[PDB]
Amino acid sequence: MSFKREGDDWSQLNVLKKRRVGDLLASYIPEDEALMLRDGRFACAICPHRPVLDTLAMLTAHRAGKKHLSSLQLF
């Protein structure tokens, strides 16, 4: 398996996929807007009640939503 690679570890590949999705989506979120918690979750720092969201995919989908946009323009 050294000379030509054999097989693939689909669980670790899925871990890598989660990292690459995270890096991609994170580069479009400015550093003030998102606060990363101790366990790897994310809070929205715009919205006054700080909702906490499990992934960066959910944080991006939140930042699309109308509650966030209304809370955004006040800040």
With CB under 8 A as the contact rule, the residue among 21, 25, 29, 43 that binds another protein is 43
Task: Considering the complex, state which of residue 37 and residue 61 has its C-beta at the smaller distance from another protein.
Answer: 37
Q: Residue 64 Cβ, how far from Zn ion at the closest point, in Å?
A: 10
**Cβ(59)–Cβ(53) under 8 Å?**
yes
The span from the CA of 18 to the CA of 15, in Å, is 5
Strand ranges of the sheet holding 52-53, from the earlier edge strand across to the other edge: 34-36, 42-44, 52-53
Return residues touching another protein (CB under 8 A): 1-2, 5, 7-9, 12-13, 16, 35, 37-38, 43, 49-50, 52
